[PDB]
Design a protein around this ligand. Structure first.
Ligand code: HEC
Length: 124
């Protein structure tokens, strides 16, 4: 739920700030840029988190590889997101690995989840 997401924001912020002293607090802007930024897959095709999750994490997404729908990521809309916070940290590390080839950095996770807490409205 939102509570659990908000607590992982603190956790990742504090990790990031230890590693990277100039990072002090989450940036919702940078979290949004990261979610929408086009990166280059090995093939040269560009993709973004938004390719599957849409440009609004409050909406239902669709996996471009399988065509399968994906529940919304924004915990205010889909309150099951971040229900088992331990499980979630492992899943998200695995998921970063799968999508990007390596884990997301602690500041990317803090910024991203912070951004998610701001998206409470599905695009209509
Ligand atoms: C399709 C190829 C995807 C792209 C590109 C990204 N994500 Fe994804 N995401 C996708 C699936 C099939 C799932 C699992 C099904 C489900 O309902 O959970 C996810 C899940 C997430 C989650 C939930 C937690 C988790 O399972 O790790 C998060 C927070 C998430 N995705 C974030 C995310 C980010 C930040 C991405 C860019 C780096 C990204 N996803 C890309 C499908 C796809």
């Amino acid at each position: 739920d939102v509570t659990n997401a908000e607590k992982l924001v603190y956790k990742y912020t504090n990790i990031a700030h230890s590693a990277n002293p100039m990072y002090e607090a989450p940036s919702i802007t940078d979290g949004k840029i990261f979610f929408n930024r086009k990166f280059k897959t090995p093939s040269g095709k560009e993709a973004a988190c938004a390719s599957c999750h849409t440009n609004n994490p409050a909406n239902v997404g669709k996996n471009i590889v399988t065509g399968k729908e994906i529940p919304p990521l924004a915990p205010r809309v889909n309150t099951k997101r971040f229900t088992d916070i331990d499980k979630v940290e492992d899943e998200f590390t695995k998921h970063c690995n799968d999508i990007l080839g390596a884990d997301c950095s602690p500041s990317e996770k803090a910024n991203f989840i912070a951004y998610l807490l701001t998206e409470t409205k599905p695009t209509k």
